[PDB]
Amino acid sequence: DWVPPEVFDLVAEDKARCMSEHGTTQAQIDDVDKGNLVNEPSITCYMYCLLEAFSLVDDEANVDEDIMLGLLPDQLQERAQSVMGKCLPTSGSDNCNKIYNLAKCVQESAPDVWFVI
Numbered sequence: 001d002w003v004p005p006e007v008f009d010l011v012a013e014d015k016a017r018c019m020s021e022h023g024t025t026q027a028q029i030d031d032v033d034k035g036n037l038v039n040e041p042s043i044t045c046y047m048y049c050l051l052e053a054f055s056l057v058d059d060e061a062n063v064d065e066d067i068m069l070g071l072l073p074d075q076l077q078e079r080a081q082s083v084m085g086k087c088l089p090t091s092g093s094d095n096c097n098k099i100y101n102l103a104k105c106v107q108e109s110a111p112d113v114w115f116v117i
């Protein structure tokens, strides 16, 4: 992708923790990455969990746009601001479901640059 390998090491402890907490499998993550998203807590609560580990969302799955933007390469800033304009604020029944809807929105809007670690 555009995601550099250093980022995988950085997320490794939290990834292991969030998969363990939520019953997530690598296969589920690969599915999401392949654009296939279902409203299963084991995947959706994983995504919320990891986002939270990096202060990208708060206790009610409100996205920190600035942190999100500061994390992305300089190239995607422009298209990411557009995707956020369409897909934020988050909404849903709970934290996991809010990230499910966000994931659905962001994938529908910017498949090219869609991905989850």
Ligand SMILES: CC(=O)CCCCC/C=C\C(=O)O
Residues within 6 Å of the ligand: 007, 010, 011, 047, 048, 050, 051, 054, 071, 115, 116, 117
């Ligand atoms: C849903 C998902 O995988 C997003 C993970 C965000 C983690 C990024 C952590 C560190 C960085 O980008 O430097």
